[PDB]
Amino acid sequence: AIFRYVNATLWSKAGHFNKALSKGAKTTTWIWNLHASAHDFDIQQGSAGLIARKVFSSGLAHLSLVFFWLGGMHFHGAYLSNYSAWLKDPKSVAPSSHIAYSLVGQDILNSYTSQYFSGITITSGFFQLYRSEGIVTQSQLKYACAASLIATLICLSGSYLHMQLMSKFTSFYKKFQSLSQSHLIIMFGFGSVSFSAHQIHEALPINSLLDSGIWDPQLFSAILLGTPSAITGKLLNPSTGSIFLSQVAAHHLAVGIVFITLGLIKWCNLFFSRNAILSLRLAYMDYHAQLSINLAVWASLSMVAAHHLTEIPVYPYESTDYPTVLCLFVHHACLSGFFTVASGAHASIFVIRQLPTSEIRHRDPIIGHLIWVCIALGLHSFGLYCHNDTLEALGRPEDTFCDNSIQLKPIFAKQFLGLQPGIEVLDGKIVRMTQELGTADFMVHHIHAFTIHVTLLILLKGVLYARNSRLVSDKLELGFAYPCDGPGRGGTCQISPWDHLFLAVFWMYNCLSVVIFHYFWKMQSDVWGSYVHHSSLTCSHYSQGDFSVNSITINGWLRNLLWSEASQVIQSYALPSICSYGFIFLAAHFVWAFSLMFLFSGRAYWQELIESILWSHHKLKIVPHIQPRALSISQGRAVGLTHYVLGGIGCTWAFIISRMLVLTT
Amino acid sequence: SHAVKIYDTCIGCTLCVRACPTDVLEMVPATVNAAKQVASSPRVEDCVGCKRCETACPTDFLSIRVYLQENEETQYSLGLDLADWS
Amino acid sequence: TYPIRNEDFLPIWKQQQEDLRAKMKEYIGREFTEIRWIGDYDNARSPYKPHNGYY
Amino acid sequence: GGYKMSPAVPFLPMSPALEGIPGEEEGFDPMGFSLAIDIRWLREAELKHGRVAMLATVGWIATDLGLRVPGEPFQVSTVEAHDAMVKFGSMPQMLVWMGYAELFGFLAIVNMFEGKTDRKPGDFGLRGFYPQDAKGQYDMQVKELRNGRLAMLAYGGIVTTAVLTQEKWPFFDAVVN
Amino acid sequence: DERDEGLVLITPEESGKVVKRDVNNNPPRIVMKTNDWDQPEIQLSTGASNQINYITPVVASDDIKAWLSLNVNFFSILALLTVGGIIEIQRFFPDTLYW
Amino acid sequence: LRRELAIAYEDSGIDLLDNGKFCQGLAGADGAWGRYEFDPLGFSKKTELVPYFREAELKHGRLAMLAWVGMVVPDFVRIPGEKFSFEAVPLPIDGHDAFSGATGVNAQILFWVGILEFCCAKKVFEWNSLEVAGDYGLTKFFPSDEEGQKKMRTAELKNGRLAMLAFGGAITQAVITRHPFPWL
């Protein structure tokens, strides 16, 4: 409440928050520690009330940042986009709300999207989102941008205010029953009901008119009008290739009602098995416990979103916008992986800072059986691929695991939609087609399970052995993020939960790369493509259905997926559309290789090299009084991990997007 | 086992002894420094080689040195728990 | 060869959309006019004299 | 006698920040903005708005009545004059000059807040037709404030009604129903 | 502190014992030490009050100049100006036709 | 008696102790022949919010008193305008839909009401107390006696509650019957 204590005097102190940074700038390690501990509000000077203040205000500031980003997206759609051309004819014109300058010949990046527009094709599905929302006018998009900017300002003001409104007595953030009830009834229930209302009152008429072909201003400014009795999802909009928006609105109304009912039964105490969860309720009333749980929840929801946004079509024309659906799936899968490893990290932090649950007292059997299942899964799943490779090379296809040869049928992969026979098409494209599972799907799914289990093994080992282990018994005293305990006892490198995350991130990236490749190749070979004429169509797929024949071997993956489908990105230099993607492919390769420097080398070599270099500076009287230092061990690991993941993700990003853009245009 | 040696640069601040995880070191009377004590390493057989003494040593270069000897590894220096060589 | 799922509905869907088009055409009473992406239209219920036709 | 009540809103107590300042005779601040923001900043912003709005009102009235400066590029209506002159190049140069003047105004505000100079909120040192007596100075400041407030409201009405009815400044021959 | 001049600031021990009104006619305010560096003291009201409580922060040009003198802002501004200069040179004299 | 708001605001704010009276001794709990302390659900047990409850009650009563008369008068007479004529709008219940949206006729009313409420929120929250609940200084015609002031406050509250129920009755009957005043 007292705002006289907020002054810019501390802005120039640069390290006031951390007491360990009091002896300001004796080395560059001080700068690095400042950055590393900037947002670690728990270990910073102050009190628990201040920690809560910072957490909540930072959440609000990030909310404002996201609102600013959304407002920028809306502004770009309104003023720097071909949304008008896309709306009138989505198929011919690729979405593009992105324009580049003509600085150094950089105008080559802009590619033909419409007669009067040239730019970069966007892959976020924002045009389809606008169409679903009923936004069909520049004025509507402009007012959406204005609302987003106003929300940004409001959130910024809220953060600034709450930095002082909340005092040491503040306890509203500890009212978990009130928090959960409010979020469940208002944020989710009422939110879903209100969005169903919005759909019914605005989007349904506009979308129906757009499907018909009407573009009249008076009409733009009778539910279930066109939807038959067919089950939702069993019949897609013939003119749009997506679930009926009236069905979506009914879904949101039902979901809001269900959430309100759940909240009300919780309010009335109808739920009875409180004791089964009371232990968790007492244990996990912590910042890091809640952060870990929420991160895992949102990771799983992001993965489900990645799957459903493609398998179940709900946005107009997103089904046929192949780059959009692919990019959405890949982006949300990557976010799922990142937030899962985050949940592991903050579980470890909670274990370090608070008392763990009693399942940590038989941790040896848990991790031992997880190790065994990881080993067995990896052996069988990957050795089937290796067996296929070796036997096929020897010239014995009859001995390999494939549909024609020994076949591993996925008996448990059974249908549940009960769809009618055939496929759904929309203007020379396959909006929806059943995925037929065989030996290749069996093998790839078990590879997925293996990688998921190994990542889980790393995270769980880090969590359970955070406090102590047979090797070192004072890991709790060591803390959360330390490089080692020493060269002793054989060597205690990377025994910390921080390093366990540092490895689990590598494994999550490996898992997600395999998942991305599986989705990409399977969709290209067996789902996406065009058709050539009760009528029967012969479907010409982009990859020509080679997944089921070539995916059974690692050589097939290397040749038919990486080498064969890298033709677009590798040969993209002359092409105006994707030359940027080719350059980013090259640069991401460079960055990934550059990460190996930090991942393989060690601190001492660089410190000694720095001292030898500094000899010459001292000789010439160039004396830096912030004495240069080699990056700490943990920082070197972090830098290597960041560059490695960024380079790999960039290579995959450019490769897939170039392929999709060229194929669809 | 490892070799833990102490040099006369020692000032007897006891930080090595306090940082010892398996109590290998102990302060002993001396006249070399003003503190009138120098760390010793009688129980070097228990030294694991963590170099926490070395980390805690203040002197410009360490007055206590732990030389690792991987060829002479014992169960005490390896911190063996599940297996017993005794 | 893959048959097209729900073939029978496509003629029905075309008939429904054409019927709705005719219904709205009759309701308005004039030919549909393409909306302008950058254009500005007066509200049909505005109390001031029209500047640009509200349709 | 209890609190000192606002003459504008008799059922609310006068904000102590707006005592001794010109315009305290009304004492209008029911929302309590003077209890949250510095009255110096509030009055500086009020005077800037009043002066800018007076100039804008007179300019809009003049352009609507006619009186366009010689030249072809200026043969546009007041509503579209903003965009026309932005394309022409007048508005960017005017904005550069505004940035210069506002840099000096910002320096004035900063120095006033830091106390380096005993500068009143809106004072820039201009003394033209300014009465010598203190009562006259107070009356002239109140006159400035009231004319500026009237000009703010008048410009809001003028711009809104012009955009709505597409009529000239008087709007008297406009149709509303 | 000029903000609270003329205010009756009673310690928690004197709450309710002192009822003298302020210069602004407000009731006395209870002052408490919180032991927080960010908010060392907090004030509670004994009743309805009509007083100025600025929500704007106290920022000094000297503090802003020190913050910009921080090496980060200095070198970021230097690098931004350099990058802008190179970009504008590329714009004005493309392809190095002179060379 | 009623003191000037300036003096009354001297002792204002959320009281913590409780005068031991029904609803802190506020007016409006008085039967025709005796005392009628109506609070079956015990809302007045929140003595700190009692002033807020009285302010809200008086606001609702005044608003509904205006609303009932505004549902009665339009059918008998209308503003001399083409869009307010009986042909454009047959019954008052149609006014909301007729004047909602781009027409702005009701938007202006909403805007001015919002401005007034924004200006009165300071009294509603800060300067609310048992004695100044619903008192905006508009005390013209207010009797200069304790008994007269109490009786006038009781009459205001009773008429406000009667109109509070009567507006619900009239609006519901009008929507059900689509008929003139008598059924509203």
Ligand code: KC2
């Ligand atoms: C607990 C049982 C109970 C029930 C079930 C019940 C039901 C109804 C019904 C519906 C069936 C109506 C429509 C109705 C109406 C009124 N009741 Mg009533 N009432 C009950 C109890 C009391 C008491 C104790 C008093 C009272 C009064 C009034 C007044 C007078 C207002 C005035 O003029 O002040 C009016 C209009 C007060 C009074 O003085 O009545 C002469 C009064 O003291 N009621 N009452």
Ligand SMILES: CC1=C(C#C/C(C)=C/C=C/C(C)=C/C=C/C=C(C)/C=C/C=C(C)/C=C/[C@@]23O[C@]2(C)C[C@@H](O)CC3(C)C)C(C)(C)C[C@H](O)C1
């Ligand atoms: C909105 C509306 C209407 C209206 C209206 C209304 C009420 C309009 C009001 C307009 C208003 C109130 C306009 C004031 C301008 C004042 C100016 C320009 C003062 C300049 C003053 C200057 C330039 C002074 C300069 C100096 O002081 C300086 C800086 C220092 C010293 O050297 C002294 C001098 C003198 C040199 C209609 C028409 C009624 C109906 C229509 O339908 C809608």
Ligand SMILES: CC1=C(C#C/C(C)=C/C=C/C(C)=C/C=C/C=C(C)/C=C/C=C(C)/C=C/[C@@]23O[C@]2(C)C[C@@H](O)CC3(C)C)C(C)(C)C[C@H](O)C1
């Ligand atoms: C017309 C319209 C609109 C509308 C509307 C509006 C404004 C609607 C307003 C509705 C309103 C205001 C409805 C009140 C109901 C009151 C009830 C039910 C009271 C019951 C009371 C009961 C059951 C009992 C009371 C008592 O027992 C108590 C408690 C104690 C006893 O001593 C005395 C008695 C027995 C009496 C839109 C949305 C604006 C536009 C749209 O186009 C259509």
Ligand SMILES: CC1=C(C/C=C(\C)CCC[C@H](C)CCC[C@H](C)CCCC(C)C)C(=O)c2ccccc2C1=O
């Ligand atoms: C290279 C390396 C160093 C030396 C690296 C250092 C000191 C980093 C240098 C930091 C610079 C000064 C930061 C400034 C950023 C770059 C210079 C930006 C270049 C951008 C280009 C596009 C021009 C370590 O210290 C280290 C420590 C532990 C494990 C591995 C390693 C390791 O691999």
Ligand code: SF4
């Ligand atoms: S070995 Fe190091 S820490 Fe131990 S007494 Fe000697 S100088 Fe001190």
Ligand code: SF4
């Ligand atoms: S290396 Fe470790 S165990 Fe060995 S003496 Fe030093 S501190 Fe003790």
